[PDB]
Amino acid sequence: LKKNMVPLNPNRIIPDETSLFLESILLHQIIGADLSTIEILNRLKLDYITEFKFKNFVIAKGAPIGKSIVSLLLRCKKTLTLDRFIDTLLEDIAVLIKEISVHPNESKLAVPFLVALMYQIVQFRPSATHNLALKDCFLFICDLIRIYHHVLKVPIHESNMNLHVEPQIFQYELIDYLIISYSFDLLEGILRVLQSHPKQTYMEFFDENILKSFEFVYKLALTISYKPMVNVIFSAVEVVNIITSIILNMDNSSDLKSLISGSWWRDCITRLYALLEKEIKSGDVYNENVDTTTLHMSKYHDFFGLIRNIGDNELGGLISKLIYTDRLQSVPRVISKEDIGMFTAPIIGYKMEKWLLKLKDEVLNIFENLLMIYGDDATIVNGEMLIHSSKFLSREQALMIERYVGQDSPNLDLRCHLIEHTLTIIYRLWKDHFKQLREEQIKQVESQLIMSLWRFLVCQTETVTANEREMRDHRHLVDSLHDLTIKDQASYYEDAFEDLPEYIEEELKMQLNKRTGRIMQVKYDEKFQEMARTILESKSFDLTTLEEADSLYISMGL
Amino acid sequence: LKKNMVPLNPNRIIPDETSLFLESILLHQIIGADLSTIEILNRLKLDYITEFKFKNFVIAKGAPIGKSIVSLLLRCKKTLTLDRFIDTLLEDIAVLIKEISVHPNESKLAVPFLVALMYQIVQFRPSATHNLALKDCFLFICDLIRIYHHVLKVPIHESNMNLHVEPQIFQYELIDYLIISYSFDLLEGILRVLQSHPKQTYMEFFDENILKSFEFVYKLALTISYKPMVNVIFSAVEVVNIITSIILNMDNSSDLKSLISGSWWRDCITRLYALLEKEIKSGDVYNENVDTTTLHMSKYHDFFGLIRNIGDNELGGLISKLIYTDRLQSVPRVISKEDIGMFTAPIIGYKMEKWLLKLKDEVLNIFENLLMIYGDDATIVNGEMLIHSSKFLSREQALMIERYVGQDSPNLDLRCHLIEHTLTIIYRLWKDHFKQLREEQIKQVESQLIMSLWRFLVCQTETVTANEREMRDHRHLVDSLHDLTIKDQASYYEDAFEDLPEYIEEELKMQLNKRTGRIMQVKYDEKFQEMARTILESKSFDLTTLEEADSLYISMGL
């Protein structure tokens, strides 16, 4: 009777999750380093704090620090289950980072590896990390960054008599760059594991102090008057993405919104506007050039970081060469600063452009989110998302048409995705938020709005493509890199791309065609033509009179 | 219908046994040492082997060794289950011990801690250690001891012109004493985890090479012409105990017995005879005195060892002070040899006598075993167990009656247990093995056999105890220490000894009475009187004529 059911396993090995977590801590290794993180902390002592102790976490004066970490780990594996083992490790390593940090004489070499270790502790099982531990860890990392106040506050230009006669040493600068970058990466990690918790419990994380501390550190990261560290700009805007994305996806959204003032957003969005108007150019990413106009990714902080692999990791060998690896020490191993740099490839510049274009996609994506949060009018959905976004759309169509077509870079498609995205940031601002699009603000960008819509409606002529034979000749000219990409995807990495049955490559010779149309800046997609049509031609606001509009239509045909 | 059964657990956490084994390795620590064993091996490098590698177990030249152990442990936790994780660790640490050992220039400081670590690997789950790993580990430890050939071969007495002008250093001597003692302790551990396996599979362990290698190392340990190390004598006779005990407790006992020659036993038993005739005296245990007559436990090897806690562990601080603990080194930290020794307590001598009396109980216990193996006659159950055991019985009755009664030492009872045990080693030799008790050999000990039986049959008079009132006055005189022992057991450590219902202390005032009788050397137990009666009076052999026997009976009464 009912011999159908799936039979259980009588000897289920539910794996010991705290043992897996112990092992993932013990063989945690940051990319490019020779030793493991615990095996670097076995080579570190702290010789000014004569006796560290918080809660049976004694470190002696000359003892290895990672000796005490692995003693804590073994001692608290036996005792605590996973959700208590996590926050025990978080508060103990936090207190150690704290009193190594607030000290006048002591070197801070243990701090980057303890922050990376703390990040490995947080993100291991995101369901197991209770969010009061996340709250305390978030507040600790924010005031840890305000301890390292000066790393994100180097001035733009130095003295003319700033003589570079100095030992030119990089090891302390490398340490506090690692501290700041791993700290911002840990803030992103805290908020994305908090994003994974059930959606009724976000108020256990958020209070006044969370948002004040992130307001300080966000004004610190997306700087105006100091040299930008791009590593922290990525993470500092991804935090704002996680914030808007959970304001959209929680039920009691009022408590976050009533907890946030208007000044928080109108200090955030102006720095996002100042970030969206910066330039992304391959030939001078890694250059040091004019300030606050080129997102540029400095040579002196080029490593991966804890989440995403952002440069080519040129400073990853120096993390391993920051310690002597056969010795127990406190001061750093000497890294010369001008030995790095040695000319082979500008492909590195192309992929750093790829990251910076995804950064601008991120910025106008959180614009797209907080249109949807503040669907009703406020201080912040206030018409300057016509000004800055239409300036952006118009210039990234203009120098696309003037500069990028036929330049065999991988980053063209994404760069003509940005415009294709930000039109929609125009469009739902036009259709669904016209009540705040003030008449004085629309005429600040009446040039650029109308011209940017015109460069979409020019594609309805379409005397270019119309067939298949010369379009593939065009994509030999503009889009050979994506032919290499799709052949490498077809021969290695895609399950659908073998034994192609003459219906799956007739979709390829539809979508490569519409891709190379959308790159060649004639024949965009029909839907974006409609969205650009129903802004200019629609009578919600008179952009053009009827005798000024057909002066634009005669410059296509019509 | 049948709502009686015990309900199972739907969320059984079967604990990950290889995680527990990983943790027991990582926090293994030998008694008296400051650091853990892995944490000592983090402080050791090997700077003459420029690159060690066996099977992806690479050690660099200046790397920490315990770094490579913990790398192997983490790497093989993921992959191997427990019975393969064990023998992977055994053969890898064996190859490391091997090529550190056979090297002319390299210091051998890693070897004691790797042997102690190997012992922790073996005995963790004895059911999980497959016995071919035990066979290979046994053969490795036996030829490891024959590598350290010279530790158990220092001569008895030195030159008169052996000037003690020399740096007088102990650290290398401490290392190879630790190597030999932990190796013999590991041989005992191999054979007792092999003793715990199911009794059909002993032939997977034993072959010719096992018994030849233990024959060599057993002739090496129980020495004749060299200075004895008592640490290895305990373990080397406990191995012979495990061998005789499993020959008694296996089904196919012939294969062990056909694998053992007669020369193996007749070289074993003569060294056991030479061990049974040594003296145990408290005032010169820890002295250095005349050779091969006093079991004496030298000052220069007084530590615990891996199984049993044998001395007071005076050299346990020097194991921790053998390394610099803030440094990665290869040569030992300098230990002065004549700093030890500083007079407070001869209680240490009493408990070392307690161990040596248990050692003699062990020797005549394996005599009792191999009477039962070779119930039929052989080369070895051959009548000299009348000579040596009756010499032993007669002298340990004689100087008990002359020296020990009223000397308030804890070791009296056990010393009058030995005689009470070895009478039975006489008795079943008398009753059940008379076919080989040759007539010429009985008259070699006809003095001592008859006198030792006479000192039991003198107790049938019993005009001493006969009541309760003066027997407790006698045990104030001879046995006050056991009153302290039973009061400490009664007030702290025994569940039955509270609310004593006047039937459980009326057994105490039976058994303290028979204990103090058996100590006072008048009124032994009635059963041992019968065993001594049915040897002398019985007519299996005419020890006495009928007119010589009543000359012995008139010296009691009769």
Short mmCIF file of N, CA, C and O in Angstrom, two decimals, chain B residues 3 30 78 135 156 181 205 208 221 228 241 243 282 323 339 357 368 397 421 446 535 541 548-549:
data_model
loop_
_atom_site.label_atom_id
_atom_site.label_comp_id
_atom_site.label_asym_id
_atom_site.label_seq_id
_atom_site.Cartn_x
_atom_site.Cartn_y
_atom_site.Cartn_z
N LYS B 3 1.78 1.75 21.37
CA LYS B 3 2.29 3.08 21.68
C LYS B 3 3.32 3.05 22.81
O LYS B 3 3.33 3.88 23.73
N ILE B 30 51.40 17.93 25.60
CA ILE B 30 52.02 16.99 26.52
C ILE B 30 52.20 17.66 27.86
O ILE B 30 52.37 18.88 27.96
N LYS B 78 39.03 17.51 4.33
CA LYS B 78 38.04 17.62 3.25
C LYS B 78 37.91 16.32 2.48
O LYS B 78 36.81 15.87 2.16
N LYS B 135 50.68 -2.10 11.68
CA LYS B 135 51.84 -2.92 11.35
C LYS B 135 52.98 -2.06 10.83
O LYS B 135 54.13 -2.19 11.27
N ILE B 156 77.90 1.10 32.02
CA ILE B 156 77.60 1.12 33.45
C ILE B 156 78.47 2.15 34.17
O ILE B 156 77.97 3.09 34.79
N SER B 181 61.73 7.26 24.73
CA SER B 181 60.62 6.99 25.63
C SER B 181 59.27 7.11 24.92
O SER B 181 58.39 6.28 25.13
N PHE B 205 48.26 -8.11 11.49
CA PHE B 205 49.34 -7.38 12.14
C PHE B 205 50.63 -8.19 12.18
O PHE B 205 51.70 -7.66 11.85
N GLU B 208 56.78 -12.37 10.61
CA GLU B 208 58.13 -12.58 11.11
C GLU B 208 58.78 -11.27 11.53
O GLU B 208 59.47 -11.21 12.55
N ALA B 221 65.92 -2.86 25.39
CA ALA B 221 65.34 -2.13 26.52
C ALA B 221 65.71 -2.75 27.86
O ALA B 221 66.34 -2.11 28.70
N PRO B 228 70.28 1.03 32.72
CA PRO B 228 68.86 0.87 32.39
C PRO B 228 68.14 2.20 32.38
O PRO B 228 68.37 3.08 33.22
N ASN B 241 53.17 -8.26 27.83
CA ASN B 241 51.88 -8.56 28.42
C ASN B 241 50.78 -8.56 27.37
O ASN B 241 49.92 -9.45 27.39
N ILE B 243 51.09 -9.11 24.23
CA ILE B 243 51.33 -10.26 23.36
C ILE B 243 50.79 -11.54 24.00
O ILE B 243 50.04 -12.28 23.36
N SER B 282 62.95 2.69 48.70
CA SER B 282 62.56 4.10 48.56
C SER B 282 63.73 5.05 48.70
O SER B 282 63.81 6.04 47.98
N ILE B 323 62.66 25.15 23.53
CA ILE B 323 62.51 26.06 22.39
C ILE B 323 62.37 27.48 22.91
O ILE B 323 62.05 27.72 24.07
N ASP B 339 71.55 22.24 36.53
CA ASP B 339 70.67 23.15 37.24
C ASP B 339 69.54 22.41 37.95
O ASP B 339 69.05 22.89 38.98
N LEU B 357 56.62 -1.61 42.13
CA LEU B 357 55.96 -2.81 42.62
C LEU B 357 54.87 -3.25 41.65
O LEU B 357 54.65 -4.46 41.47
N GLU B 368 52.25 -15.66 34.84
CA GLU B 368 50.95 -16.31 35.02
C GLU B 368 50.22 -16.50 33.70
O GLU B 368 49.50 -17.50 33.53
N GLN B 397 59.00 -12.07 51.55
CA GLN B 397 58.45 -12.30 52.88
C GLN B 397 59.46 -11.96 53.96
O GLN B 397 59.09 -11.42 55.01
N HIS B 421 50.41 -12.87 45.38
CA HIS B 421 50.20 -13.27 44.01
C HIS B 421 51.18 -14.37 43.61
O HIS B 421 50.77 -15.35 42.97
N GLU B 446 64.84 -25.62 47.83
CA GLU B 446 64.12 -26.44 48.78
C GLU B 446 64.14 -25.80 50.14
O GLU B 446 63.19 -25.98 50.92
N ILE B 535 50.82 -27.82 48.79
CA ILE B 535 52.08 -28.02 48.10
C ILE B 535 53.05 -28.81 48.97
O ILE B 535 53.62 -29.80 48.53
N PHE B 541 55.37 -34.64 45.34
CA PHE B 541 56.81 -34.74 45.46
C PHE B 541 57.16 -34.65 46.93
O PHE B 541 56.57 -33.86 47.66
N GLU B 548 60.77 -35.03 59.07
CA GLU B 548 61.20 -33.66 58.85
C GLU B 548 60.04 -32.69 58.77
O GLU B 548 60.23 -31.49 59.00
N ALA B 549 58.84 -33.17 58.45
CA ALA B 549 57.69 -32.28 58.35
C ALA B 549 57.21 -31.85 59.72
O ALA B 549 56.99 -30.66 59.97
#
